[PDB]
Design an enzyme around this catalytic site. Structure first.
Site, PDB file in Angstrom:
ATOM      1  N   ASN A  26      44.121 -68.845 -31.981  1.00  0.00           N
ATOM      2  CA  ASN A  26      44.098 -67.495 -32.546  1.00  0.00           C
ATOM      3  C   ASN A  26      45.292 -66.621 -32.169  1.00  0.00           C
ATOM      4  OD1 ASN A  26      43.380 -64.749 -33.293  1.00  0.00           O
ATOM      5  ND2 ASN A  26      41.422 -65.648 -33.922  1.00  0.00           N
ATOM      6  N   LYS A  60      47.856 -57.561 -33.787  1.00  0.00           N
ATOM      7  CA  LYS A  60      46.531 -57.029 -33.466  1.00  0.00           C
ATOM      8  C   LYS A  60      45.758 -56.759 -34.751  1.00  0.00           C
ATOM      9  CE  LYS A  60      46.074 -52.869 -31.625  1.00  0.00           C
ATOM     10  NZ  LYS A  60      45.983 -51.772 -30.639  1.00  0.00           N
ATOM     11  N   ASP A 250      35.725 -64.678 -26.727  1.00  0.00           N
ATOM     12  CA  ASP A 250      35.290 -63.282 -26.910  1.00  0.00           C
ATOM     13  C   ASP A 250      35.517 -62.729 -28.352  1.00  0.00           C
ATOM     14  OD1 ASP A 250      37.868 -63.374 -24.783  1.00  0.00           O
ATOM     15  OD2 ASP A 250      38.266 -62.429 -26.734  1.00  0.00           O
TER      16      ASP A 250
HETATM   17  O1  LIG Z   1      36.250 -60.379 -41.223  1.00  0.00           O
HETATM   18  P1  LIG Z   1      37.475 -60.990 -40.362  1.00  0.00           P
HETATM   19  O2  LIG Z   1      37.366 -62.578 -40.249  1.00  0.00           O
HETATM   20  O3  LIG Z   1      38.883 -60.582 -41.055  1.00  0.00           O
HETATM   21  C1  LIG Z   1      37.232 -60.332 -38.732  1.00  0.00           C
HETATM   22  N1  LIG Z   1      36.383 -61.230 -37.839  1.00  0.00           N
HETATM   23  C2  LIG Z   1      35.016 -61.493 -38.469  1.00  0.00           C
HETATM   24  C3  LIG Z   1      33.811 -61.497 -37.485  1.00  0.00           C
HETATM   25  O4  LIG Z   1      33.149 -62.547 -37.387  1.00  0.00           O
HETATM   26  O5  LIG Z   1      33.494 -60.429 -36.836  1.00  0.00           O
HETATM   27  C4  LIG Z   1      37.156 -62.431 -37.363  1.00  0.00           C
HETATM   28  C5  LIG Z   1      38.209 -62.284 -36.181  1.00  0.00           C
HETATM   29  O6  LIG Z   1      39.326 -61.673 -36.803  1.00  0.00           O
HETATM   30  C6  LIG Z   1      37.764 -61.494 -34.840  1.00  0.00           C
HETATM   31  O7  LIG Z   1      36.596 -62.237 -34.382  1.00  0.00           O
HETATM   32  C7  LIG Z   1      38.790 -61.547 -33.523  1.00  0.00           C
HETATM   33  O8  LIG Z   1      37.965 -61.392 -32.346  1.00  0.00           O
HETATM   34  C8  LIG Z   1      39.947 -60.437 -33.344  1.00  0.00           C
HETATM   35  O9  LIG Z   1      40.829 -60.508 -34.477  1.00  0.00           O
HETATM   36  C9  LIG Z   1      40.890 -60.577 -32.031  1.00  0.00           C
HETATM   37  O10 LIG Z   1      40.237 -60.728 -30.672  1.00  0.00           O
HETATM   38  P2  LIG Z   1      41.055 -60.620 -29.163  1.00  0.00           P
HETATM   39  O11 LIG Z   1      42.210 -61.759 -29.099  1.00  0.00           O
HETATM   40  O12 LIG Z   1      40.016 -60.854 -27.948  1.00  0.00           O
HETATM   41  O13 LIG Z   1      41.767 -59.153 -28.954  1.00  0.00           O
END
Ligand SMILES: O=P(O)(O)CN(CC(O)O)C[C@@H](O)[C@@H](O)[C@H](O)[C@H](O)COP(=O)(O)O
Length: 284
Positions: A26, A60, A250
């Protein structure tokens, strides 16, 4: 008909051409942190003759603020690609956020991405259109598969045609996602038989968790990533890290770096015969 084919180097993705592997991790934590991740994927691919593209993100936007681990940032973000890059000359992929930077990024990387949240955003659909590269579409959890021709058509309308479609599940009740393996064809059809790729990682996260009968994470990535594979997709999408990830222990969900091999072997044998099977149908 036969499936369209956006060609990513010696790698050609296609809904009949083998499930290309779109691995990565990620948030781009560290220039060399990644290596452990590049190198270890790189190997398994060739060992199993699975193709590989590396997924990596530099910013971010999503979650914690004011700076809260905001990601490497563009300038010094793109630098880090060029290392994993030639170290094994590799096809990489980065999501963009706001138009302007739809040209910088589109240089060191092979498969640019358009984050779910700015999907139907037009001016980024364009700012990438003014590129002509291999785009990856993050299919929003609130869009009916049937609406993917209204992201694709217009991409082409942007000059850019080299499009890809990624599914991250769809929402099911407050906080939870699900996937309808039946949504893959519907996306195929509505989208010029563009390749259809499964983001097995983001997808099942709120899925594994549906509080009460869950409330403390737990994982089943291959279990679900085999479903995609047995329906017949273009390939998978996964992110890993040794002890899960800093941005996935997380953030959403992830996959054990060195558990990755027999995962794919499940996904290779399973795929294997499915991409074999001579096309059938039951509408008669
Ligand atoms: O709807 P999206 O997939 O664009 C956002 N979500 C969906 C969800 O399951 O809440 C996916 C991820 O982007 C999100 O879980 C990540 O935790 C976030 O981008 C970064 O986390 P971090 O490195 O700890 O600062």
């Amino acid at each position: 008909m036969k499936q369209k084919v956006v060609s990513i180097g010696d790698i050609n993705v296609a809904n009949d051409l083998p499930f290309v592997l779109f691995g990565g991790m990620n948030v781009l934590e560290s220039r060399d942190l990644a290596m452990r991740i590049c190198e270890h994927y790189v190997t398994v691919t060739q060992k199993l003759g699975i193709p590989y593209v590396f997924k990596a993100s530099f910013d971010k936007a999503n979650r914690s603020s004011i700076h809260s681990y905001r990601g490497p940032g563009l300038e010094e973000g793109m630098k880090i690609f060029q290392e994993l890059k030639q170290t094994f000359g590799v096809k990489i992929i980065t999501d963009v956020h706001e138009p302007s930077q739809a040209q910088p990024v589109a240089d060191v990387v092979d498969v640019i991405q358009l984050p779910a949240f700015l999907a139907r955003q037009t001016d980024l659909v364009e700012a990438m259109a003014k590129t002509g590269a291999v785009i990856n579409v993050k299919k929003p959890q609130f869009v009916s598969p049937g609406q993917m021709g209204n992201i694709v058509d217009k991409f082409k309308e942007g000059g850019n045609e080299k499009v890809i479609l990624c599914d991250r599940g769809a929402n099911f009740g407050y906080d939870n996602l699900v996937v309808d393996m039946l949504g893959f064809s519907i996306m195929k059809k509505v989208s010029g038989n563009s390749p259809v790729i499964f983001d097995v990682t983001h997808a099942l996260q709120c899925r594994d968790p549906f509080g009460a009968a869950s409330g403390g994470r737990r994982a089943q990535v291959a279990e679900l990533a085999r479903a995609g594979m047995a329906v017949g997709l273009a390939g998978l999408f996964i992110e890993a890290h040794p002890d899960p990830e800093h941005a996935k222990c997380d953030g959403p969900s992830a996959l054990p770096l060195a558990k990755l091999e027999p995962f794919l072997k499940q996904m290779k044998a399973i795929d294997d015969l499915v991409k074999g099977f001579e096309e059938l149908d039951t509408s008669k």
